[PDB]
Ligand binder design. Structure first.
Ligand code: HEC
Length: 106
């Protein structure tokens, strides 16, 4: 269900596997981030991003200047609408990880 949420309030700056190599577009690749970044921070950042950057909470201040020097605004989503989108990033990562010694596209 989180895939429909991605397509309607998220795909404007993102993908789940499909940035350009070492070139993060308007916003970096979400596939596998659920198993790299802190699992509380990932969901909380999505609920208050431009105001976490205004708190000067330094985890964000470090990461944003190293992708594309652009800020993410708050989309103003609801908690259960976020929970479904967390389950899209988690379950699409669980299927589209493609560790078959062939993830590339010819
Ligand atoms: C363009 C205005 C954006 C929209 C809309 C969304 N995101 Fe984003 N994202 C954007 C940038 C510039 C960056 C870097 C700063 C930051 O927001 O962290 C990102 C990054 C992420 C990350 C963190 C990646 C990491 O290295 O850990 C996540 C997990 C993320 N964004 C999630 C996310 C979701 C779920 C959104 C749709 C509802 C969303 N973003 C919208 C820019 C933009």
């Amino acid at each position: 269900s989180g895939e429909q949420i991605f397509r309607t309030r998220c795909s404007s700056c993102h993908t789940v596997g499909n940035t350009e190599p070492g070139q993060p577009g308007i916003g970096p690749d979400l596939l596998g981030v659920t198993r790299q970044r802190d699992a509380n921070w990932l969901v909380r950042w999505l609920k208050v991003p431009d105001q976490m950057l205004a708190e000067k909470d330094p985890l964000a201040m470090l990461l944003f200047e190293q992708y594309n020097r652009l800020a993410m605004p708050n989309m103003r989503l609801g908690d259960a609408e976020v929970s479904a989108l967390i389950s899209y990033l988690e379950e699409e990562t669980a299927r589209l990880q493609t560790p078959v010694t062939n993830r590339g596209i010819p």
